[PDB]
Amino acid sequence: DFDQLFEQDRAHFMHPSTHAHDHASGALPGRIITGASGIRIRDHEGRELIDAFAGLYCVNIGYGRTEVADAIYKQAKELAYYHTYVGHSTEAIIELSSRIIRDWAPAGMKKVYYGLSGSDANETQIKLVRYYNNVLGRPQKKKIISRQRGYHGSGIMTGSLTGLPSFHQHFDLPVEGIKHTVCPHWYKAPAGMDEAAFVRYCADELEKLILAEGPDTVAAFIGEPVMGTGGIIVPPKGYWEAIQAVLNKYDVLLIADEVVCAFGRLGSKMGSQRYGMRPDLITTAKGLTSAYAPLSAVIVGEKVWDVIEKASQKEGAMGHGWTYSGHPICAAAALANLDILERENLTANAADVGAYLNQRLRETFEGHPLVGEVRGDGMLAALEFMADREARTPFDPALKVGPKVSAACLEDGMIARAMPHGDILGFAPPLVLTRAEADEIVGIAKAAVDEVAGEVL
Amino acid sequence: DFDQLFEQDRAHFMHPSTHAHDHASGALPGRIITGASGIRIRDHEGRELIDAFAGLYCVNIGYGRTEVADAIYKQAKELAYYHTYVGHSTEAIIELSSRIIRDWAPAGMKKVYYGLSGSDANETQIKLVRYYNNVLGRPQKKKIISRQRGYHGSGIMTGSLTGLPSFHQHFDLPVEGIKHTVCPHWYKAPAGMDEAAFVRYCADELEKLILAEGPDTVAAFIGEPVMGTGGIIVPPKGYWEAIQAVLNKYDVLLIADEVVCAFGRLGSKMGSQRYGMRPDLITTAKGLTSAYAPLSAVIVGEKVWDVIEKASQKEGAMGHGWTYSGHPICAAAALANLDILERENLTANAADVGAYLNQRLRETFEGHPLVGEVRGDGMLAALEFMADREARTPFDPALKVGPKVSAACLEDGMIARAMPHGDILGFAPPLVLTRAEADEIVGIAKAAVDEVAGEVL
Ligand SMILES: *Cc1c(COP(=O)(O)O)cnc(C)c1O
Numbered sequence: 001d002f003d004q005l006f007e008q009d010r011a012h013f014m015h016p017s018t019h020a021h022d023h024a025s026g027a028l029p030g031r032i033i034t035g036a037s038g039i040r041i042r043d044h045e046g047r048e049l050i051d052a053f054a055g056l057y058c059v060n061i062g063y064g065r066t067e068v069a070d071a072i073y074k075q076a077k078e079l080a081y082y083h084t085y086v087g088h089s090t091e092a093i094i095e096l097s098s099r100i101i102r103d104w105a106p107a108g109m110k111k112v113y114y115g116l117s118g119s120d121a122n123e124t125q126i127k128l129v130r131y132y133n134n135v136l137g138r139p140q141k142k143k144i145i146s147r148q149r150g151y152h153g154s155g156i157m158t159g160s161l162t163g164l165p166s167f168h169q170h171f172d173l174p175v176e177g178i179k180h181t182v183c184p185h186w187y188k189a190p191a192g193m194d195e196a197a198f199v200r201y202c203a204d205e206l207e208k209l210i211l212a213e214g215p216d217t218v219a220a221f222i223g224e225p226v227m228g229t230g231g232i233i234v235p236p237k238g239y240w241e242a243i244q245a246v247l248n249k250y251d252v253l254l255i256a257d258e259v260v261c262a263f264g265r266l267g268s269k270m271g272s273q274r275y276g277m278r279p280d281l282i283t284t285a286k287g288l289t290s291a292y293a294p295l296s297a298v299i300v301g302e303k304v305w306d307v308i309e310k311a312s313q314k315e316g317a318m319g320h321g322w323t324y325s326g327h328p329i330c331a332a333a334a335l336a337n338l339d340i341l342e343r344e345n346l347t348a349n350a351a352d353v354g355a356y357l358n359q360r361l362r363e364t365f366e367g368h369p370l371v372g373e374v375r376g377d378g379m380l381a382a383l384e385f386m387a388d389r390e391a392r393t394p395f396d397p398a399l400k401v402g403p404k405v406s407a408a409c410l411e412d413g414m415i416a417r418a419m420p421h422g423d424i425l426g427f428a429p430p431l432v433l434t435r436a437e438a439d440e441i442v443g444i445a446k447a448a449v450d451e452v453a454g455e456v457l
Numbered sequence: 458d459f460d461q462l463f464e465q466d467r468a469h470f471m472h473p474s475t476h477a478h479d480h481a482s483g484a485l486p487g488r489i490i491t492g493a494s495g496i497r498i499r500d501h502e503g504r505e506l507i508d509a510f511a512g513l514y515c516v517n518i519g520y521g522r523t524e525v526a527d528a529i530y531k532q533a534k535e536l537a538y539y540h541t542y543v544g545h546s547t548e549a550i551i552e553l554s555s556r557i558i559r560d561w562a563p564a565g566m567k568k569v570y571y572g573l574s575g576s577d578a579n580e581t582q583i584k585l586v587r588y589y590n591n592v593l594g595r596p597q598k599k600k601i602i603s604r605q606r607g608y609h610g611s612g613i614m615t616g617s618l619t620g621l622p623s624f625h626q627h628f629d630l631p632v633e634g635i636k637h638t639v640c641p642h643w644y645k646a647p648a649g650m651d652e653a654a655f656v657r658y659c660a661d662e663l664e665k666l667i668l669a670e671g672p673d674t675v676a677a678f679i680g681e682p683v684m685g686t687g688g689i690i691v692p693p694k695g696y697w698e699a700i701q702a703v704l705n706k707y708d709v710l711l712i713a714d715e716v717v718c719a720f721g722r723l724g725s726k727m728g729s730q731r732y733g734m735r736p737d738l739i740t741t742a743k744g745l746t747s748a749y750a751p752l753s754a755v756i757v758g759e760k761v762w763d764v765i766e767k768a769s770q771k772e773g774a775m776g777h778g779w780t781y782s783g784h785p786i787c788a789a790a791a792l793a794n795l796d797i798l799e800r801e802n803l804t805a806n807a808a809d810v811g812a813y814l815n816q817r818l819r820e821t822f823e824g825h826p827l828v829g830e831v832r833g834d835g836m837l838a839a840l841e842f843m844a845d846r847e848a849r850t851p852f853d854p855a856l857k858v859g860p861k862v863s864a865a866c867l868e869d870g871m872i873a874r875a876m877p878h879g880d881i882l883g884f885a886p887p888l889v890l891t892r893a894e895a896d897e898i899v900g901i902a903k904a905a906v907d908e909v910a911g912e913v914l
């Protein structure tokens with residue numbers, strides 16, 4: 001009966017991030033997912049696929065967790081929804097807020113504000129940064145600095161923070177007031193620079209840009225500890241220490257975008273502790289619930305919270321609120337997700353098997369003639385494909401090497417993403433992954449990379 | 458142990474729309490909701506309150522629907538989540554998309570795009586309006602016109618559309634490019650104008666503003682059929698016909714913001730059919746799931762969809778996507794919600810009992826010395842309090858008459874909202890409301906209004 005559903009799909013469902021015409025015509029074939037379990041999903045044809053991307057870096061505890069379904073259900077029966085306006089709460093949202101601060105967030109974090117998506121979380125961050133400066137009497141200190149290849153969402157303001165051109169095309173972005181310093185990708189550094197030199201370059205370029213704009217006009221700097229969607233750029237050694245020194249010098253807030261990195265993905269609690277970042281504000285989503293329900297959390301530091309608190313005395317309640325902020329079933333899902341992360345120590349398993357997977361990818365693909373670089377950290381890994389490795393020359397985009405390798409992986413029964421704006425194969429498997437399953441993943445990638453190299457080299 | 462939960466609440470939970478200091482100090486006392494059923498919620502002290510506001514205009518099928526919990530649970534077990542990127546779907550999201558278009562949306566609607574909140578839905582609308590114009594080669598046609606007292610969300614861009622100052626304070630809003638024409642509130646019209654004259658005034662003011670800005674720079678006009686949060690402003694007879702004529706003359710898209718009005722609230726399928734609106738784009742959330750799970754839907758008309766579809770051929774896939782777009786458990790919740798709305802004909806009940814409630818409040822409050830106007834439509838109603846009715850003179854805001862009446866209602870065990878920026882008591886009860894329950898609501902309001910009158914007058 002799937003033919004009828006696909007007719008309806010093409011007629012009426014506008015998908016995110018999907019070629020509108022090819023989808024409506026049938027040229028881009030649809031795929032219905034009917035179930036899932038462990039690290040595998042099942043499609044409408046009965047195929048069982050290894051999901052080496054955990055949905056979108058988000059199904060961290062793995063698929064098919066009926067424990068989380070039970071928790072969601074229980075809360076849905078008891079109280080599916082009430083608002084959290086004007087001091088209203090559930091037990092679940094209170095408990096979740098204290099657990100995030102006490103067990104997961106870095107030191108000196110104080111409060112949590114809830115939305116539904118990473119994008120609305122970063123939208124909240126922009127509102128908060130402005131508010132902070134206005135109530136401290138600095139109405140000019142408003143600009144946000146992001147980075148090239150950063151992903152921070154798909155809205156107008158959040159799309160502007162995003163430093164990938166597809167999220168800007170025909171939307172008139174980035175808006176004035178948001179700027180982009182350099183992507184800290186060492187492999188693509190100015191030729192001849194060593195790691196320490198490149199760090200200095202990145203710091204100097206940021207300093208330069210702050211000064212060019214005027215430090216009294218620059219409010220915040222936003223960054224992922226490890227860049228995910230852009231894809232899987234690990235920062236060079238000393239990058240975050242060097243950047244923070246510049247930010248302290250000019251009194252610029254650090255927003256850590258931990259939507260991908262939080263809740264165990266890198267083998268640490270969050271990327272911020274792992275890289276010695278000391279952010280003033282933190283964005284989370286994805287691994288917060290392992291996607292069992294939609295939820296985002298903005299974690300607010302002492303510095304910013306204290307200013308917001310004092311200001312309310314003279315300025316009244318801050319005018320910010322989503323109807324579904326603190327949604328009970330979503331909170332309940334998060335609590336169950338956290339219970340599982342803690343009980344099975346999936347943070348530890350991510351460090352263990354992530355190191356193993358990364359090292360196995362390194363052995364098997366360093367020196368391979370299609371591959372320009374192997375990178376990764378914890379349970380994130382990527383192969384970037386280049387026409388000329390030492391020259392840092394990419395393939396012609398129209399050759400579609402990344403997408404071809406991904407497609408070959410999918411024919412062998414594995415999902416691994418062709419990352420955007422480059423020829424990059426990304427891995428972000430569930431944190432329950434075993435060594436055996438990692439070996440299988442690497443085997444399938446080997447075959448797919450060999451096959452595509454045979455066709456294009 | 459609720460004392461410990463409130464200690465944790467104050468320490469760690471940043472609520473939406475809540476005085477930060479008063480909340481943290483304890484001056485604004487917290488409230489935990491533990492259960493709910495029909496039209497009543499239960500707090501942490503065992504108090505049972507009549508919720509005459511259905512959460513926030515959103516719990517339309519009523520509280521305690523274990524049918525929806527069952528549907529959520531079933532989907533959580535089967536497949537809680539996969540993405541809907543690149544043509545991927547579930548059965549539920551496909552079914553929901555065809556049911557919205559076929560059974561609920563007005564004629565000539567084609568596609569549905571999903572988010573999680575009303576705000577992110579309207580953010581999608583802005584992105585879509587820009588895209589449309591850019592790919593038609595009109596890069597100047599970008600400005601959006603909203604209205605004074607419109608509520609369209611709590612983001613930066615969506616906060617700008619919002620025409621209530623609290624959503625702008627210390628956020629530097631509205632952003633350049635968004636403008637606000639007049640609030641179509643007849644009772645507050647220029648003195649001496651009759652209904653038909655006021656309609657003409659509103660049309661002329663809009664024409665004026667389009668011309669002042671330059672019609673080739675104006676892309677869209679956004680409006681709620683009936684203004685909710687602003688609060689409960691029913692448009693004058695002929696307003697929407699007159700406004701649409703102006704919009705057609707200058708080729709300006711109509712965005713109907715149906716977050717409140719959709720799915721039965723006004724006694725029609727949506728407000729747009731009810732008021733003869735023919736929008737190009739529609740925003741929905743709230744009543745789409747009755748808040749049992751977070752979901753928003755942008756409904757895209759044929760005109761706009763066809764342009765988007767053609768454009769993808771030369772321009773490639775549109776760069777828009779939320780990770781949780783089309784979230785399966787949320788879709789499943791919507792389907793169950795729709796099943797209930799249709800089965801118990803809650804649209805009809807909303808028309809019946811809503812007319813009864815509105816009339817029953819007109820009888821009891823028209824002529825009452827505290828009340829300047831009684832207004833409403835379907836299951837929306839409001840009492841606006843004035844110092845001088847015939848003069849249209851409001852009370853001193855510092856007298857807090859609206860909030861006082863609301864507080865008195867809450868002591869008698871009923872929740873009814875003190876609407877912002879005015880002295881207004883709003884009603885938006887679940888659509889399952891009976892005549893008997895409406896009488897009870899009116900009784901409690903009478904007592905509370907009498908008490909506050911014999912106290913301020
Ligand atoms: C993946 C990611 C998001 C995703 O946001 P959604 O609105 O949930 O799509 C947001 N911010 C950052 C930094 C990310 O890495």
Ligand SMILES: *Cc1c(COP(=O)(O)O)cnc(C)c1O
Binds near residue numbers: 579
């Ligand atoms: C109530 C309303 C919203 C609410 O948005 P959330 O983000 O769900 O709180 C948004 N837009 C409009 C037009 C509304 O009337």
